[PDB]
Amino acid sequence: GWDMQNVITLDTSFEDAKTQVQLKKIHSSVILLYCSKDEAVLILSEARS
Amino acid sequence: LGLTGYDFFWIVPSLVSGNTELIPKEFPSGLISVSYDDWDYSLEARVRD
What count of CB pairs under 8 Å joins A to B? 6
* Beta carbons of B28 and B10 less than 8 angstroms apart: yes
State the resolution, in angstroms: 4.0
Question: What are A's interface residues with B at a Cβ cutoff of 8 A?
Answer: 21, 24-25
Total Cβ atoms within 10 A of residue A10: 16
Task: Label residue A20 exposed, middle or buried (CB < 10 Å: 0-12, 13-18, 19+).
Answer: middle
- Distance (Å, rounded) from C-alpha B48 to C-alpha B8? 41
Between the alpha carbon of residue A23 and those of residues A43, A46, B3, B15, the distances in Å are: 10, 9, 14, 32
Find out whether B40 is annotated in a ligand binding site: no
Helix-then-strand count for chain A, H and E: 2, 0
B2 to chain A: which residues are within 8 Å by CB? 21, 24-25
A24 to chain B: which residues are within 8 Å by CB? 1-2
